[PDB]
Amino acid sequence: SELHGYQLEAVAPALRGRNSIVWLPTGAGKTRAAVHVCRRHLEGRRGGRVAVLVNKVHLVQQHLEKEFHVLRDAFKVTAVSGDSSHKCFFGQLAKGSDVVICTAQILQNALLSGEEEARVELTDFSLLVIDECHHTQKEAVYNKIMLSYLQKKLSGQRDLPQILGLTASPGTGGETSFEGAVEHILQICANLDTEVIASAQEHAQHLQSHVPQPTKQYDLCQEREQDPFGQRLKKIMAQIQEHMEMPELPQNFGTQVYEQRIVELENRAAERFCRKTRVCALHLRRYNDALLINDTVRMMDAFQCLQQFYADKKDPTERFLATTFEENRATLQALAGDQRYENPRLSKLEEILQEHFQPPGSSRGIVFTKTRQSAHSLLSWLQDTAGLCGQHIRAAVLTGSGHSNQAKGMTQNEQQDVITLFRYGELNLLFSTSVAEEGLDIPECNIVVRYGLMTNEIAMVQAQGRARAQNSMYSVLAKANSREVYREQLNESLVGLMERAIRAVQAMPERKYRLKIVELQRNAVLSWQVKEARSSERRQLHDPDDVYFHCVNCNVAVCRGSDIRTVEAMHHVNINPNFRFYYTVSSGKIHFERTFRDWEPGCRIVCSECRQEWGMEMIYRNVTLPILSIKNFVVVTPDEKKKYKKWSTVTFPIEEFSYLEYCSSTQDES
RNA sequence: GGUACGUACCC
RNA sequence: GGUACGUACC
Ligand SMILES: Nc1ncnc2c1ncn2[C@@H]1O[C@H](COP(=O)(O)OP(=O)(O)O)[C@@H](O)[C@H]1O
Ligand code: ALF
Ligand SMILES: [Mg+2]
Ligand SMILES: [Mg+2]
Ligand SMILES: [Zn+2]
């Protein structure tokens, strides 16, 4: 497994100490090239230290086990992710290592830490390797780390680390002209403090006939001729809107636009406390989710989302709605049972799998879907489909750690189990989210299907690339004449523009490039400063005593701004000793997969008057504190009443929690 | 469960 | 300015 010519060529500038981006195709071997750069870096000085940053939990282990472990003949290499996190302080672990591999946010947390044992500076490393470095833009973690690097650089700081970015796809950043695309490439160079974009110019022929391209096919599907299940949902949505007695109610049932309008209505009804309107809007949204699920997967998947909503449950509005569902329930379930009205997305997916998993399972595939819920539903569909039950498909779901009431996440270990069985064919088919669109290496994977996705060209290129095998195939499975098909074709062209843009940046005169980089780095550090000042202005508009929180459901006042403190600059706790008379504990003890350094979860908490979900208890060392979720309240200030979805935009200051001070004050009372 | 960011969409 | 989803951290 000695380095290919093009790998040695792409790291020549890195070996000379220059900051670079290594631009090589998906599956070309950027990781092994980085390892070689790390070895020579560490051999060439004493006391060097490398950090290797990734953007998914699963890439930490993959990169350690498949590539970086070889450095252990001479050097100390440690991996840190979230799951393991809580045992060691990161500062101690890094400083005791020659190479640390971690998700970027782990490093960022250490860079911001107040504790001496956890804290790190950028100057504690001599080389940073940034995997999938195209994410180093905007306010992503990668770019927060690098903007601090730029601030320091521009302020004269010395011995900042060398930067080695790795990517197959810098992208065009939404730009469709050559001018724009070039401007985007230079911004990424500026963000990463890049001196050279290194590629395989002199080994372009070896790289062509070695790293194979999958052959590409459009597997287009038609709209259902007859959708009586959908038609019936739409009738009910109209009946509910009639009952609401409101003009200018939107009519485009079964779309993301309708979903936006109806949630925006629900926000307004919460803000003005129109209880009737808010309740109807909440139900209508649920009918709209069912239509969307219906278009994506099975009728019965859509039916079950709706039925679980009405089964969990008085006042006259809710009673109208319960009755309306009950009137239609049996008919909806019977329609969902009928094979005549099958989703042609699914018929089309069946053909593909039928053709490519015969002989029974020589193929090795990933079907990409947008949502975790869709991936689970597709697995169920596979298992209850006879046309495939006969061939031997051992399938599983792969998701990241994202989580909601619609679908839970998968931990590091649970992801790893699926990946390991897929690698050598114990599993031969994954239903996956974008968790696995980049970086994942399965040499034998020979089939990628992208199931009705709407993404940028980076995600298209990257997901294709998971098919590492010779003779791979890539399928676009989408609706004919859709926006999704249009975007796919546009993205193909945007990949070409991206290439043209990079080559133009690569051939620029050195003086003209350096001045442009300088100009862009300056504007970045100034733009950030201005943005920070503007965020702080907003944060100090109101005294915390003049802000009141109301329950989003019943509008009762529950606490003031001055009752709130932050734990780890994230979790908003109410420290008022009488807040306990306003909330009720509504569950038994909640258990997470991950465990944290200073706290564990207690029970869910609800509004004592209406039972609306508010948040959860945190058992922080020796005390129990209620954590509030901003989405479950209307915030009332002197100027307005506003339902917030984030805490960063609130108009009053919130201090950090002090465990010490809190104990003193609570222990004085009884 | 909490927090943040990214992508897509609408304005 | 919002809506949805995803991932990462806790
Ligand atoms: N010089 C080499 N010889 C043989 N195999 C290699 C070489 N370099 C990389 N590989 C293998 O090629 C595959 C793709 O590498 P990877 O680092 O995942 O690609 P990417 O460039 O997309 O990060 C891996 O399985 C890796 O072990
Ligand atoms: F470009 Al890669 F894994 F880094 F496909
Ligand atoms: Mg949540
Ligand atoms: Mg890679
Ligand atoms: Zn309430």
Numbering used by the authors: 1 to 313, 317 to 673
Any passages from the paper?
Homologous double-stranded RNA (dsRNA) dependent ATPases RIG-I, MDA5, and LGP2 (RIG-I-like helicases [RLHs]) are key cytosolic pattern recognition receptors in the vertebrate innate immune response against RNA viruses. LGP2 differs in lacking CARDs and thus independent signaling activity.
To further characterize RNA binding to chLGP2, we determined structures with the 5′ppp form the same 10-mer dsRNA (i.e., the cognate RIG-I ligand) and a 5′ppp hairpin dsRNA with 3′ GG overhang at 2.2 Å (chLGP2-10ppp) and 2.0 Å (chLGP2-3′ovg) resolution, respectively. The α- and β-phosphates interact with His406, Ser407, and Asn408 from the Hel2-loop, and the β- and γ-phosphates interact with Lys634. The affinities of LGP2 to various dsRNA ligands were determined by fluorescence anisotropy. chLGP2 binds to a blunt-end 12-mer dsRNA with an affinity independent of whether the 5′ is a hydroxyl or a tri-phosphate, consistent with the lack of significant additional interactions to the tri-phosphate (and its variable conformation) observed in the crystal structures. In addition, while hRIG-I’s affinity to 5′ppp dsRNA depends on which nucleotide is also bound, being highest for ADP:AlF4 (Kd ∼ 1 nM) and 20 times weaker with ADP or no nucleotide, the affinity of chLGP2 for dsRNA is independent of bound nucleotide.
